[PDB]
Paper text:
The human assembly system uses two GTPases, NOA1 and ERAL1, which act as molecular switches that promote the first steps in the formation of the decoding centre and the platform. In state A, NOA1 regulates docking of helix 44 (h44) through two mechanisms. First, an N-terminal extension of NOA1 blocks access to the h44-binding site at the tail of the mtSSU, which is occupied by h44 in state B. Second, the globular domains of NOA1 hinder h44 docking at the subunit interface while also sequestering h27 away from its mature position. Within NOA1, we found a vacant GTP-binding site that is partially occluded by a helical insertion of NOA1, which prevents the switch I motif from occupying a conformation competent for GTP binding. Our reconstructions provide a structural rationale for this biochemical data, suggesting that TFB1M activity is allosterically regulated by the stability of the platform, which is controlled by the 3′ rRNA-binding assembly factors ERAL1 and RBFA. This mechanism is coupled to upstream events in maturation as a NOA1-bound h27 would preclude platform compaction, ensuring that h44 docking occurs before platform formation and h45 methylation. The discovery of ERAL1 within states A and B enables a direct comparison with bacterial systems in which available structural and biochemical data indicate that the binding modes between mitochondrial ERAL1 and bacterial Era are similar. In states A and B, ERAL1 binds to the rRNA 3′ end with a C-terminal KH domain in a flexible manner, with the GTPase domain binding uS7m. In states A–D, the presence of both of these factors prevents compaction of the 3′ major rRNA domain, splaying rRNA elements and protein modules apart to allow for significant intermodule flexibility.
Author numbering:
A (entry chain U): 27 to 103
B (entry chain D): 190 to 229, 239 to 430
C (entry chain N): 4 to 112
D (entry chain 0): 6 to 55
E (entry chain M): 10 to 124
F (entry chain O): 48 to 237
G (entry chain T): 2 to 165
H (entry chain 0): 165 to 216
The structure:
RNA sequence: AUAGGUUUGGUCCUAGCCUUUCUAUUAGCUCUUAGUAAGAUUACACAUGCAAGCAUCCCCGUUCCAGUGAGUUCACCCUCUAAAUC
């Protein structure tokens, strides 16, 4: 791809990107659908984040890990 | 049929040995030419004979005419037969490493279906003897007479399983991977059994060959090893 | 997470004491020859902080990694002297010894 | 490694030039109303803003 | 490698051969090449129906959840796949495209009736 | 023309085969012509090229009575090691590449049809536990929307926007408007 | 033939026959042994036969030797915590030394099995990629799926040339 | 509601752990506030065009 | 309650009835070969090796569990009618999380109608094979399991090979597994080839099938003819335990039958061919007396 | 390497060179169709056309992708800890 230092093409110096036409009903329904979808997805995302953090907690300072460490120390002694 | 090459005498069959003056017939014996040389003129031939059931021999014949040399060598060979012991009548009883003069021979016992992957002269002699599965590597000077003499010496000086059992007074138990952990007793002493077990040598002081270990570890890189070849 | 120094505990022989409060120690490790599959000694020099200047050339010492390097080449400190040169105490019996013979018998105690 | 001092010099002088040539809002956000372009950069505004 | 910014994203890396596409679902830095270095392979997707008339999607749901919980983004095709699996809600654009297709087929049926 | 084409195995039990080959394999007496002591690592592509045989045809091609068919079990056994059950590579018997491929396919077909013996190992079970009580293999409680016939989420369904919002959109996008769309068909038109 | 007495020691099979995999605490092994004296025979054999195996299974542990410095042979282990474990080996056989060090400071078989199981997880059989890492390169190697066009040409209708 | 597959997996996990609750799993969204796309952003965090 | 196939008592009876022939259990395999190894052994060492081989055979002869046919999976997770008609082929989603048992693994199908349902048992097995390939199993069903090929295999007396293929291909509780095992057992019964399965892990399942289907006459006859009287008596006892309310068990209780008397009671009460059972028992007793 | 040929009036030994095998490039002569894969010798010089936009203005992006192998222990592990995502 081009870099910031490459000149613009002369074939498209007078090119204006025209916006697409909008269907009002579909546009409105789609905005509402995106809103609801993104709320649901963000809720799911934070649950996954909390699951990951909880797994880290139980892998570092969990009861089972602590008991395993104590068992190892007792066998060593 | 041709021999080892189109213009080579080696490998060519001479037919059965002639009926000896003793009155015996040798129709079950086959003869193969191993070498034909011009002596400066006369002809010196090295031939080998064998019945395919462990009895085999070799001899040199010298004569002005080639056919007379063939006949002399064949007739003398049949009266100097070695008997070669074969494990299950297809291979040798153990690995045999030998040196005859400057020629070295390393022979390895192999399972059934392995074939004769050996020097061509060794293939001929093994077919005459009746060995069907063996590996052999020849090193040093490749001299045909020395090769034959060393091969026959090593094959005649092998210890059978029964001989080992009698010597050690212990069961010789065979372990096969295809048969699982089942112990197969292949030889038992005719005499009494020792009740003291063999010393469990933690590390034996055996003389290993670098080529075999190199092959085992995957450091052997020869483009000539394990090449596809016709059935032998 | 206790130190930034790679080698944490190492045993070596003191080969130099010409520095102030710093002992030059020789550390041997076993390295496998990839071809011969035999182990050979590979040597590495370490500098150990000796605050009390108690090292003598030839003695076997143990070095512990510092929490951080105190100098360019000083990254370890002398935890103890395993074998003082010519003044070895048999760890098994706790008696002074000279080579393979006891200087004082274990039975004396 | 041969220390690269020209790189440091270039970075320092470029930083100095930036901090002493900070454009002002009157220059950055001026607009040509006939062509609807920013004179500072020459970039045209999007059509939906025109 | 070190990039200026960027993030992890779970996306489809294209392999296979000409006229036979296949996708590997991978979590990768968004600045990396499409079929280049990745952090972990999270599944696969065969877009061609097999002899049973099935499109096969393998999803490592545990690891997908792990990487979403570690801050990884999702590409739109991956979101649509997860919606089809029922792991996410149906993406808005799948619904909208379904409605557009329904309207187009209705127009075609009306044309047939008019003729 | 072979009278055994329909029923190939008869040729192996016919007397003519017994004089020609005896009890030895059909490839025993073949020797390939090549330079050097080390043969080439691949055999010729095919001994029959445009209905013409080469000077030294392979064991299969010399004898038009020998038919490579998955039912011709006694012939196929000659190309498999009886001690290891491995199909010989082509240089071993000298068969050309074409006939070697045909023999491999025939041997595999005969094994798949149970006509050719091969070692079938005894394997361990896939699963340590055979219970089928988990919800993945059982019935999950239906969700209220599913039993009620409703979509999983209300926004899956189309709801006509109020006229005020539509007029708002028409003002916002004046001059760049498509024809307004109504509710979609209830089901996919065919 | 291979040089030296007991050349089998210089084979990876022998080197991997070792069964002593030290816990993560062990950092250093110092081995004091006497060249002469029957009571140290096993210790001498320990140096000759089992040190290569121990080092092979534990590449990061510093193993060092000392000859005729003390009247009796012994092993000393230095742990990460700074603790020192002394194991007298006089009158013991080399196999006994192996068993003792395995028992006191060697990972049990169960831990090794969990480590192996943890290793198994990295090479997921479902993943597709190079043969170095994966069982299969492409889904086209799975029976029933559309095969590779290299071996079986796709029908003309599935090819862009005859769809354009 | 949870998505169908996530709901099924949650119910399966509960049933495997011995719970027999018939209460539908639910995803909480009162904490996720739908912020309009045209709400003002933080002008303090925004960048500035560089002189050139 | 009625004993299960895995009960310790039933397991012990079937284990002793199966037998343990080391030569048959460890028959030479036709496979890639390596040079054998050799060891010098005393009598004590040889006996130790034989006992270790017997233990290995016991592990090898472990019986597969007998399971009931799995119920078909017909469960719908969702019906998104909006998707109806937008796709022409179904999507199969397999959860490939490594540390999950294959019977707890979620495998779902999105149909062209928009229905998200659970995969059927056959689809589950196919997908598990696709993503967790097992040595010996095929994604597509081998043709050897057709009727004609199974008949050929039985004609060659390769019933154990058929059962090994079935074990490698199908799950124990699948319809195909049960059908193939039942067909093999029926063939063995109809041509009296029970000895084919002795010293294998399939003998116990064959005996269990015969007992639950009340067709132990042929196996009892074979055991009598092979002088395996303990096995025949144990078979009668197991039959009585599985059918404690049958006239045979009641007759045994009434007559206080023990040993061969159990066989006689069974022959007179609940034997389809009790006359031949009596004839064979009488011949066996005469031969025993003469010997 | 399963080896083979070649020193002599002749035998044996040693030793070099070469043959047989498998790839890649180029050249000669000769070449029908289909699918797939791969594809300047040169870090020598380059005509021409394209390869970066998007977006209600702010910002964001053009620091990626793509290319080459000139130079050359900056790549891997541990410690510590910025920027970035959540
Ligand atoms: S490698 Fe899979 S389609 Fe070619
Ligand atoms: K922008
Ligand atoms: K370079
Ligand atoms: Mg010629
Ligand atoms: Mg030479
Ligand atoms: Mg490109
Ligand atoms: Mg790049
Ligand atoms: Mg930060
Ligand atoms: Zn041919």
């Amino acid at each position: 791809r081009k870099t910031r230092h490459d000149p613009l093409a002369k074939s498209k110096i007078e090119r204006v990107n025209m916006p697409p036409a909008v269907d009002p009903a579909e546009f409105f329904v789609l905005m509402e659908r995106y809103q609801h979808y993104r709320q649901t997805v963000r809720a799911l995302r934070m649950e996954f984040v909390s699951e990951v953090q909880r797994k880290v907690h139980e892998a570092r300072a969990g009861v089972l890990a602590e008991r395993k460490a104590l068992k190892d120390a007792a066998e060593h002694r | 049929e041709r021999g080892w090459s189109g213009n080579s005498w080696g490998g060519i069959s001479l037919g059965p040995p002639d009926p000896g003056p003793c009155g015996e017939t040798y129709e079950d014996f086959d003869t193969r030419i191993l070498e034909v040389r011009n002596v400066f003129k006369s002809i010196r031939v090295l031939v080998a004979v064998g019945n395919g059931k462990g009895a085999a021999g070799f001899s040199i014949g010298k004569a002005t005419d080639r056919m007379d040399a063939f006949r002399k060598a064949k007739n003398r060979a049949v009266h100097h037969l070695h008997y070669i012991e074969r494990y299950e009548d297809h291979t040798i009883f153990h690995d045999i490493s030998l040196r005859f003069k400057r020629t070295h021979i390393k022979m390895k016992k192999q399972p059934k279906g392995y074939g004769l992957r050996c020097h061509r002269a060794i293939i001929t002699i093994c077919r005459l003897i009746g060995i069907k599965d063996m590996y052999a590597k020849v090193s040093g000077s490749i001299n045909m007479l020395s090769l034959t003499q060393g091969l026959f010496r090593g094959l005649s000086r092998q210890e059978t399983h029964q001989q080992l059992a009698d010597k050690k007074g212990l069961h010789v138990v065979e372990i096969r991977e295809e048969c699982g952990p089942l112990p197969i007793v292949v030889a038992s002493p005719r005499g009494p059994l020792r009740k003291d077990p063999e010393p469990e040598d933690e590390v034996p002081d055996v003389k290993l060959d670098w080529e075999d270990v190199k092959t085992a570890q995957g450091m052997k890189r020869s483009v000539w090893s394990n090449l596809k070849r016709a059935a032998t | 997470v206790r130190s930034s120094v790679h080698a944490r505990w190492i045993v070596g022989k003191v080969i130099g004491t010409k520095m102030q409060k710093t002992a030059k120690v020789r550390v041997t490790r076993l390295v496998l020859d990839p071809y011969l599959l035999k182990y050979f000694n590979k040597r590495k020099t370490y500098f150990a902080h000796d605050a009390l200047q108690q090292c003598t050339v030839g003695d076997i010492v143990l070095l512990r990694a510092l929490p951080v390097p105190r100098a360019k080449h000083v990254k370890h400190e002398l935890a103890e002297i395993v074998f003082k040169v010519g003044k070895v105490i048999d760890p098994v019996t706790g008696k002074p010894c000279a080579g393979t013979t006891y200087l004082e018998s274990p039975l004396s105690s | 490694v041969r220390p690269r001092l020209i790189a440091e010099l270039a970075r320092r002088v470029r930083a100095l030039r930036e901090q002493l040539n900070r454009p002002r809002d009157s220059q950055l956000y001026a607009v040509d109303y006939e062509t609807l372009t920013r004179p500072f950069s020459g970039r045209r505004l999007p059509v939906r803003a025109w | 490698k070190a990039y200026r910014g960027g993030h992890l994203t779970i996306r489809l890396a294209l392999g296979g051969c000409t006229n036979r596409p296949f996708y590997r679902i991978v979590a990768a830095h968004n600045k990396c090449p499409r079929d280049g270095r990745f952090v972990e392979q999270l599944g696969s997707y065969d877009p061609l129906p097999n002899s049973h008339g099935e499109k096969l999607v393998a999803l490592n749901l545990d690891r997908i959840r792990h990487w979403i919980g570690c801050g990884a983004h999702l590409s739109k095709p991956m979101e649509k796949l997860l919606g089809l699996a029922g792991f996410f809600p149906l993406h808005p654009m799948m619904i909208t495209n379904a409605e557009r297709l329904r309207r187009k087929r209705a127009r075609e049926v009306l044309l047939a009736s008019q003729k | 023309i072979s009278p055994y084409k329909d029923e190939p195995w008869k040729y192996l039990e016919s007397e003519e085969y017994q004089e020609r080959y005896g009890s030895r394999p059909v490839w025993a007496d073949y020797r390939r012509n090549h330079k050097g002591g080390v043969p080439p690592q691949r055999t010729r592509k095919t001994c029959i090229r445009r209905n013409k045989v080469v000077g030294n045809p392979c064991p299969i091609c010399r004898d038009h009575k020998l038919h490579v068919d998955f039912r011709n079990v006694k012939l196929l056994e000659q190309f498999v090691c009886a001690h290891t059950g491995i199909i010989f590579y082509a240089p071993y018997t000298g068969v050309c590449v074409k006939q070697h491929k045909r023999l491999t396919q025939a041997i595999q077909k005969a094994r798949d049809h149970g006509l050719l013996i091969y070692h079938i190992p005894q394997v361990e079970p896939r699963d340590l536990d055979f219970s089928t009580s988990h919800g993945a293999v059982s019935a999950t409680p239906p969700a209220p929307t599913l039993v009620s016939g409703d979509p999983w989420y209300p926004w899956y369904n189309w709801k006509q926007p109020p006229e005020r919002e539509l007029s708002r959109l028409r003002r916002l996008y004046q001059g760049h408007l498509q024809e307004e769309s109504g509710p979609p068909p209830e089901s996919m038109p065919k | 033939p291979m040089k030296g007495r007991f050349p089998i020691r210089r084979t990876l099979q022998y080197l991997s026959q070792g069964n002593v995999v030290f816990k993560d605490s062990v950092k250093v092994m110092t081995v004091n042994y006497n060249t002469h004296g029957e009571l140290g025979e096993g210790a001498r054999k320990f140096v000759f036969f089992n040190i290569p195996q121990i080092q092979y299974k534990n590449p990061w542990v510093q193993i060092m030797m000392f000859k005729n410095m003390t009247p009796s042979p012994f092993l000393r282990f230095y742990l990460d915590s700074g603790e020192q474990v002394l194991v007298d080996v006089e009158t013991k056989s080399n196999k006994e030394i192996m068993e003792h060090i395995r028992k006191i400071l060697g990972k049990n078989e169960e831990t090794l099995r969990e480590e192996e199981e943890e290793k198994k997880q990295l090479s997921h059989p479902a993943n597709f990629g190079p043969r170095k890492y994966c069982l299969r390169e492409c889904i086209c190697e799975v029976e029933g799926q559309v095969p590779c066009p290299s071996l079986v040409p796709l029908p003309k209708e599935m090819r862009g040339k005859y769809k354009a | 509601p949870y998505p169908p597959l996530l709901r099924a997996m949650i119910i399966a996990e509960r049933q495997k752990n011995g719970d027999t609750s018939t209460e539908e799993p639910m995803l909480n969204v009162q904490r996720i506030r739908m912020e309009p796309w045209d709400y003002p952003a933080k002008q303090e965090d925004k960048g500035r065009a560089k002189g050139t | 309650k009625k004993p299960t196939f895995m009960d310790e008592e039933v397991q012990s009876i079937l284990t002793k009835m199966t037998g343990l022939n080391l030569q048959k259990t460890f028959k030479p395999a036709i496979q890639e070969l390596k040079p054998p190894t050799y060891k010098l052994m005393t009598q004590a060492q040889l006996e130790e090796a034989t006992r270790q081989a017997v233990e290995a055979a016991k592990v090898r002869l472990k019986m597969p569990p007998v399971l009931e046919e799995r119920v078909p999976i017909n469960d719908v997770l969702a019906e998104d009618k909006i998707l109806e008609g937008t796709e022409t082929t179904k999507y199969v989603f397999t959860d490939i999380s490594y540390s999950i048992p294959h019977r707890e693994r979620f495998i779902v199908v999105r149909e062209p109608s928009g229905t998200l349902r659970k995969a059927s048992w056959e689809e589950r097995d196919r997908m598990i094979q696709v993503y967790f390939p097992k040595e010996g199993r095929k994604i597509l069903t081998p043709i050897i399991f057709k009727e004609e090929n199974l008949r050929t295999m039985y004609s060659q007396d390769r019933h154990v090979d058929v059962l090994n293929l079935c074990f490698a291909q199908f799950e124990p509780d699948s319809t195909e597994y049960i059908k193939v095992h039942h067909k093999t057992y029926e063939d063995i019964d109809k041509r009296g080839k029970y000895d084919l399965l002795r010293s294998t892990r399939y003998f116990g399942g064959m005996v269990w099938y015969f007992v639950n289907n009340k067709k132990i006459d042929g196996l009892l006859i074979d055991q009598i003819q092979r002088d395996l009287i303990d096995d025949a008596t144990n078979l009668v006892q197991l039959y009585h335990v599985l059918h404690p309310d049958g006239q045979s068990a009641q007759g045994a209780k009434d007559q206080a039958a023990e040993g061969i008397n159990l066989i006689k009671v069974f022959a007179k009460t609940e034997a389809q061919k009790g006359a031949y059972i009596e004839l064979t028992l009488q011949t066996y007793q005469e031969a025993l007396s003469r010997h």
